[PDB]
Amino acid sequence: TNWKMVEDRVKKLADEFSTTWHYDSEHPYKTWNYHGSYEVKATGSASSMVNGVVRVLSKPWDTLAMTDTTPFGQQRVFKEKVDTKAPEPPKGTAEVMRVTAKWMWKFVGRSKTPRVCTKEEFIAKVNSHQNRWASAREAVEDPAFWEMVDREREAHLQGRCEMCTYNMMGKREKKMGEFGKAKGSRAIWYMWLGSRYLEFEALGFLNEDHWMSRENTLGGVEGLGLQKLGYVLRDIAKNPGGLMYADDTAGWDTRITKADLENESIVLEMMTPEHRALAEPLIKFAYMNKVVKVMRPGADGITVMDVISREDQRGSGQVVTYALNTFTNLCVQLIRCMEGEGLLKPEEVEKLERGKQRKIQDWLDKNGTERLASMAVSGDDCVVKPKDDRFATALHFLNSMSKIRKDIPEWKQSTGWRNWQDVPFCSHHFHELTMKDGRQIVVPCRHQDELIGRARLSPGSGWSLTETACLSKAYGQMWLLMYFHRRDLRLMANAICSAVPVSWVPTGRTTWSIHGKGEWMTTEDMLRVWNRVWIEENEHMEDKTPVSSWNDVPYLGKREDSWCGSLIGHRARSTWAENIYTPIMQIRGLIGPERYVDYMPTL
Numbered sequence: 001t002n003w004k005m006v007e008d009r010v011k012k013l014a015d016e017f018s019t020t021w022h023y024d025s026e027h028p029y030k031t032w033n034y035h036g037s038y039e040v041k042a043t044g045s046a047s048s049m050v051n052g053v054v055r056v057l058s059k060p061w062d063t064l065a066m067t068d069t070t071p072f073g074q075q076r077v078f079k080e081k082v083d084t085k086a087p088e089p090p091k092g093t094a095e096v097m098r099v100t101a102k103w104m105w106k107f108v109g110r111s112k113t114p115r116v117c118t119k120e121e122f123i124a125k126v127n128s129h130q131n132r133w134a135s136a137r138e139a140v141e142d143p144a145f146w147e148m149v150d151r152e153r154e155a156h157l158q159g160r161c162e163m164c165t166y167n168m169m170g171k172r173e174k175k176m177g178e179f180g181k182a183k184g185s186r187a188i189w190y191m192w193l194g195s196r197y198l199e200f201e202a203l204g205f206l207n208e209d210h211w212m213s214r215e216n217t218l219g220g221v222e223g224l225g226l227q228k229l230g231y232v233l234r235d236i237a238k239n240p241g242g243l244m245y246a247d248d249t250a251g252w253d254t255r256i257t258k259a260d261l262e263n264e265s266i267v268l269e270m271m272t273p274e275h276r277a278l279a280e281p282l283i284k285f286a287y288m289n290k291v292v293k294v295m296r297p298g299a300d301g302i303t304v305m306d307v308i309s310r311e312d313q314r315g316s317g318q319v320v321t322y323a324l325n326t327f328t329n330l331c332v333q334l335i336r337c338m339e340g341e342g343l344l345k346p347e348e349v350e351k352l353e354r355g356k357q358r359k360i361q362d363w364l365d366k367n368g369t370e371r372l373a374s375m376a377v378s379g380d381d382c383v384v385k386p387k388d389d390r391f392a393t394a395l396h397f398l399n400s401m402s403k404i405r406k407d408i409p410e411w412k413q414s415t416g417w418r419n420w421q422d423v424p425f426c427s428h429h430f431h432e433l434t435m436k437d438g439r440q441i442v443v444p445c446r447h448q449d450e451l452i453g454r455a456r457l458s459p460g461s462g463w464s465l466t467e468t469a470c471l472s473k474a475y476g477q478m479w480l481l482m483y484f485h486r487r488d489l490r491l492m493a494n495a496i497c498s499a500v501p502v503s504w505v506p507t508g509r510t511t512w513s514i515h516g517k518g519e520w521m522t523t524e525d526m527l528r529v530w531n532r533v534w535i536e537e538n539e540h541m542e543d544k545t546p547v548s549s550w551n552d553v554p555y556l557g558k559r560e561d562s563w564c565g566s567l568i569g570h571r572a573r574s575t576w577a578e579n580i581y582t583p584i585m586q587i588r589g590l591i592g593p594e595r596y597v598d599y600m601p602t603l
């Protein structure tokens with residue numbers, strides 16, 4: 001019965017594709033109300049090409065379905081993950097969420113004030129990493145494009161919305177898990193570029209002004225690269241409290257309740273009316289009443305496009321998806337801390353006690369800063385060090401908020417970690433190492449099979465040798481900067497760089513995490529970049545003496561490296577390393593004549 005909100009958007013699609021627009025009574029949508037369907041050509045594929053460069057240089061890992069833009073792929077993820085409704089919080093829980101959100105918004109806005117983002121900033125982003133136009137940069141250079149933005153912006157000021165419709169492109173696996181980089185059914189969403197700017201214009205200040213940064217929220221890690229994250233966990237462990245907990249919420253984006261949207265939407269109260277006049281219509285029309293285009297398999301070998309709507313979820317493609325998820329997750333963990341400390345009873349979920357609203361405010365006013373400082377929240381990933389170990393059994397308000405934990409019974413006690421180095425965070429754990437010179441360094445680490453698996457695969461077909469070589473070099477230089485402590489990766493990274501020409505600039509996408517800042521994507525010597533990253537820019541390195549050679553860069557212990565998937569000690573690797581020059585030359589022959597550098601002697 002939300003037809004009025006989504007009336008204009010559906011009709012525009014229906015009118016534009018009226019020659020094929022129709023109604024399909026056999027649609028499988030359950031939690032989405034279905035409007036109509038029109039025919040489209042099949043877009044995308046399920047072909048994941050193997051990286052020949054990485055393949056020949058990782059022969060022992062030959063023993064070691066990924067990204068489905070196919071219309072069959074889009075429907076499968078929608079049927080299993082997207083098409084669901086998270087239960088709304090009860091009355092008592094909602095007040096707790098509302099009080100926490102108000103306190104957090106006032107806290108995160110203590111020094112920063114909301115502002116409107118200009119098109120010049122948006123033009124800066126598109127130039128720095130389509131139906132009529134064929135390029136994003138070409139569109140922003142067209143005055144006709146900005147007219148479409150203006151007319152749609154005028155509609156928002158008039159209380160209307162016509163073009164802010166989402167596109168369900170398909171699936172992109174969330175994690176690289178068991179092996180081969182295959183885990184997670186994450187849904188990727190695309191939206192029109194004009195709507196992207198209007199969203200950026202109204203809510204871009206959350207990202208551009210770093211509202212979720214650690215110096216602002218005290219619990220967020222926004223803007224911190226993977227190198228900085230390790231020291232954060234060690235610093236949290238220095239604080240008093242109990243064990244460290246890192247619980248994943250299964251389908252977090254699909255479990256964003258309508259109360260969560262409302263609680264995040266009270267930032268408009270901190271904005272100027274002129275700014276609110278632009279942001280208020282957008283949140284109501286784009287987030288709170290979505291219009292989504294999904295391809296569905298059809299009969300006679302034809303593909304069809306559906307138009308549907310809902311009210312609650314998070315689009316996962318919203319420009320402030322990460323920032324809003326960090327805000328709500330920080331609120332969720334703070335609420336669970338209150339239940340663990342006895343402030344919130346399991347019965348107060350249905351109805352809060354008499355004075356337990358100002359008392360919650362009192363607890364946040366006193367313990368909010370201290371509790372947040374012992375948290376590390378990146379989107380839906382979280383690490384919390386609570387006051388005591390009663391936090392493990394404080395599952396009532398957590399499950400009431402539909403933030404059900406992943407791969408665990410609903411009411412089974414959560415288990416914490418005794419050593420901060422074992423705590424998972426952003427698909428990584430962190431090891432503490434002592435260098436040859438005696439200095440200590442905290443490094444990110446994850447199972448080696450996951451790292452090799454993603455490099456071996458390339459998105460789509462039609463890859464040239466030059467393109468797939470630069471992507472391989474990007475993986476190799478990334479390994480040297482982040483995973484230098486892994487013996488197999490360091491040897492394999494040099495092998496790629498020895499096989500790939502020196503002058504070639506690395507390209508491609510080697511990481512999906514927002515914490516991958518791509519310092520490895522330069523042609524500068526990685527040893528020089530390594531000194532800048534881990535010594536010069538390292539706030540936890542008082543002694544700024546630079547490292548003079550790669551041999552001074554430490555490895556993990558053979559016990560800790562073997563535990564995390566290294567193939568040292570196996571006969572297969574011993575042969576692989578001894579004869580590593582043979583695969584290097586084969587790639588050089590295939591590429592052709594060029595200038596190269598041999599990096600094996602540096603090992």
Ligand SMILES: [Zn+2]
Nearest residue numbers: 161162163164
């Ligand atoms: Zn709109």
Ligand SMILES: [Zn+2]
Nearest residue numbers: 431445446564
């Ligand atoms: Zn490890």
